[PDB]
Amino acid sequence: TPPSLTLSSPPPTGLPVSPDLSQPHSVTLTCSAASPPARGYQYQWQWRRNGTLLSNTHTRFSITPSTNTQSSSLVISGLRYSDAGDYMCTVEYGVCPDGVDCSGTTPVTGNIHLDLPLIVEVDSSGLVAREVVVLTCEVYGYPRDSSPPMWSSPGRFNITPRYTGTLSNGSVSSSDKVALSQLTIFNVADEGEYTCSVAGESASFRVD
Numbered sequence: 001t002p003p004s005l006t007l008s009s010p011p012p013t014g015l016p017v018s019p020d021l022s023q024p025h026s027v028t029l030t031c032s033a034a035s036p037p038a039r040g041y042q043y044q045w046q047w048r049r050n051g052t053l054l055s056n057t058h059t060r061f062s063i064t065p066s067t068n069t070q071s072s073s074l075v076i077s078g079l080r081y082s083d084a085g086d087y088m089c090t091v092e093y094g095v096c097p098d099g100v101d102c103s104g105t106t107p108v109t110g111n112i113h114l115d116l117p118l119i120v121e122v123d124s125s126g127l128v129a130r131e132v133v134v135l136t137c138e139v140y141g142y143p144r145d146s147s148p149p150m151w152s153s154p155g156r157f158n159i160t161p162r163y164t165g166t167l168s169n170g171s172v173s174s175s176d177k178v179a180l181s182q183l184t185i186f187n188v189a190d191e192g193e194y195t196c197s198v199a200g201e202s203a204s205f206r207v208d
């Protein structure tokens, strides 16, 4: 007798989510049932990560239903790269009127895929007198490991480490980028692509 229950989001193929990289310390994941509960009914939600039920007793995870229970949001705080990947949201009937049988209704689970990128940028001073170009390798997002930046350029100068500490236990705002390294060119023949590589990611600047 009870109304049907399915998810509008995520769909069967899952939902990708990525954070606001200007405010990277937390992200909100939301799932929604396709229809609101009828009068006298409520939905109940469960969230899982790594096979494991999440609840509000967890420090970095906070779950909140909508007023009508049609949706549920998980806020992950203290975000770091290792939080990336799949999260599962499951909806079921939580309350049903007496004399309605909800026990035949199967819970519905969706998958959210949380993408936590690491972006590299190579910025230039321009040619300046301190004779010289200074390139700075900067990152933002979610550093994966402690791998130092590696500079490259086909063929081929001072490399000064800038920030050398660990960033993989947290995140870096796109409007508070971290400088990892600087390539100084002392002194036409130096024109061309210079690349900074930080683990799997890279960016270039063409010095002309």
Ligand SMILES: *[C@@H]1O[C@H](CO)[C@@H](O)[C@H](O)[C@H]1NC(C)=O
Pocket: 049, 050, 082, 083, 084
């Ligand atoms: C989930 O599993 C991965 C792989 O073992 C791990 O890096 C991560 O810390 C685990 N915990 C969370 C909350 O993502």
